């Protein structure tokens, strides 16, 4: 897990030897793994590249971070408001700093991860201090231009 780098944000043009060919300049990528879905039978955008040394994986994570690969925000990492279609290049501290401009955050946010890879699932949950920050996130942040990924902010629970 230390020598392997988890890549997120892969489109349909990216393939299993294509990621190994793109990561060959960063370091000696020994193997590439792409988990296939059960309903569609294709990649879900997240994969893994197992290299030989941990320094090559660190250089690939520091070089290929927030890159625009196949029209997709590909990024390598070390393997009541709901935000969907978020970029995997952002972290919890980056999401807390991005959410601090609209309103005040009550605590540190959390992002959902896949049970197989564990880098990024695609959705996240963040809680605001009051309902005014949630309304400002649903008015402004729900549709704002993020890092090559259109996010969507919505209410997790609402009572009619």
């Amino acid at each position: 897990q230390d020598a392997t780098v988890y890549v997120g944000g892969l489109d349909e043009k990216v393939s299993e030897p294509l990621l190994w060919e793109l990561f060959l300049q960063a370091g000696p990528v020994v193997n590439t793994h792409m988990p296939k879905d059960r309903v569609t039978g294709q990649h879900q955008g997240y994969g893994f590249v197992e290299f030989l040394s941990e320094e090559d994986a660190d250089y690939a994570i520091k070089i290929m971070n927030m890159i625009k690969l196949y029209g997709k925000p590909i990024r390598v990492n070390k393997a009541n408001i709901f935000i969907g279609n978020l970029d995997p290049e952002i972290d919890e501290k980056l999401l807390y700093d991005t959410f601090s401009a609209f309103g005040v955050i009550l605590q540190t946010p959390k992002i959902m991860r896949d049970p197989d890879t564990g880098n990024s699932k695609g959705y996240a949950f963040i809680n605001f201090a009051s309902f005014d920050a949630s309304d400002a996130a649903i008015e402004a942040m729900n549709g704002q231009y993020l890092c090559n990924r259109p996010i969507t902010v919505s209410y997790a629970f609402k009572k009619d």
Partner: protein, 123 residues
Amino acid sequence: SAFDLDVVKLTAQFVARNGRQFLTQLMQKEQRNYQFDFLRPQHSLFNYFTKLVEQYTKILIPPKGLFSKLKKEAENPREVLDQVCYRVEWAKFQERERKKEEEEKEKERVAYAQIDWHDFVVV
């Protein structure tokens, strides 16, 4: 982080003995080729340096132990218990004020989510 904290404590001790706002022992040190990034207010350590300077100024008070001796806080446990009870009452009043502010914010959020947003009038 011990050397930076010691430098901040030395700057707070040297700046508290000044007779003016700008005529201090640290303003002339900035022009004497001494790098001090904690003097600018843009850094996060400046908020702690200001609190250290405030504590150094409060350590120079006449009831702080320079020319007088405290008798109520040092020789009366009942006065300390009354001060602790007053601090607990102030904390309870602050918690009640925060709960009232949260209730007012919830009432404003309930009133804003129930008003009609289709009756537009441009005058």
